[PDB]
Ligand SMILES: COc1ccc(C2=NN(C3CCCCCC3)C(=O)C2(C)C)cc1OCCCCOc1ccc(-c2nnn[nH]2)cc1
């Protein structure tokens with residue numbers, strides 16, 4: 659044929675939901691043969707006309723995406739290619755919000771989506787602090803500073819150097835330097851050690867908010883533009899509790915598998931077991947309510963204020979999920 663396979667058709671039908679919060683990302687992972695990041699990135703690049711805008715050869719895009727997807731670990735429960743695909747797709751929906759219409763350049767949009775795609779690549783499924791405490795090679799290479807996030811960037815960029823992988827080959831040096839700086843600034847902002855300063859800056863921006871040509875945010879300097887993109891990808895990274903409950907609970911199962919495996923490695927080595935990593939002293943439900951109350955709701959309430967009323971349904975889902983987890987605590 660020159661026509662898709664029946665499995666390719668069922669996948670194409672699921673990918674019609676790519677512009678919606680609550681995409682069936684686990685179903686896309688199954689239908690694509692464990693290629694959700696490649697098919698979601700390819701769909702988004704075609705939808706936003708990024709191949710034409712950036713003169714990206716389609717074979718180069720697909721080669722890079724498969725290579726990037728292959729550097730995520732299928733034997734890590736949470737920080738895998740499905741999480742990367744989910745953050746990409748969630749960023750893509752946030753970039754389309756009414757309040758940001760015509761705000762960002764094509765290069766800023768490419769930076770946010772590419773950053774989302776690479777932001778956890780080659781994640782070993784243990785925390786920065788675990789890597790530091792174990793004298794791991796990664797912690798030594800990055801001098802204990804944003805160890806994982808430095809690594810994700812270095813890998814994401816180094817893979818551009820593999821055979822037919824340079825998706826930026828037709829960008830000018832000016833475009834490449836601007837893109838690279840923005841991608842670095844965004845992925846380094848995914849380190850949870852930066853969360854309280856990012857949130858403080860987002861709150862300051864909401865308090866001093868300006869809108870222009872009616873209803874659209876005014877961002878007239880790099881500091882403000884990069885801060886919104888950093889907070890946007892950080893919101894996407896912390897989006898699991900804002901999703902329909904069938905999706906959220908799969909994310910909770912996966913993060914707790916990864917945390918409990920780290921806690922097993924800590925216990926067996928005589929280390930202090932990290933917060934929420936002890937399967938013998940766990941409350942999954944209390945931990946989700948704490949996560950929402952102290953991290954996810956303060957961030958998403960502030961994001962919702964910046965883009966008000968655009969994120970009202972996302973904030974309502976978060977509040978409903980929080981009440982659901984609270985109601986299951988013995
Ligand atoms: C779908 O689910 C989760 C997805 C991801 C995480 C993460 N978590 N983090 C780190 C976040 C910071 C806390 C440590 C964990 C690591 C990541 O790097 C990431 C990987 C972002 C976690 C998910 O949920 C698992 C429950 C954690 C409970 O998080 C909290 C926080 C705060 C208080 C609190 N404060 N004051 N009083 N209580 C209680 C509980």
Ligand SMILES: [Mg+2]
Pocket residue numbers: 731732733734
């Ligand atoms: Mg592995």
Ligand SMILES: [Mg+2]
Pocket residue numbers: 777778806848849
């Ligand atoms: Mg990360």
Ligand SMILES: [Zn+2]
Pocket residue numbers: 741745777778848895
């Ligand atoms: Zn992540």
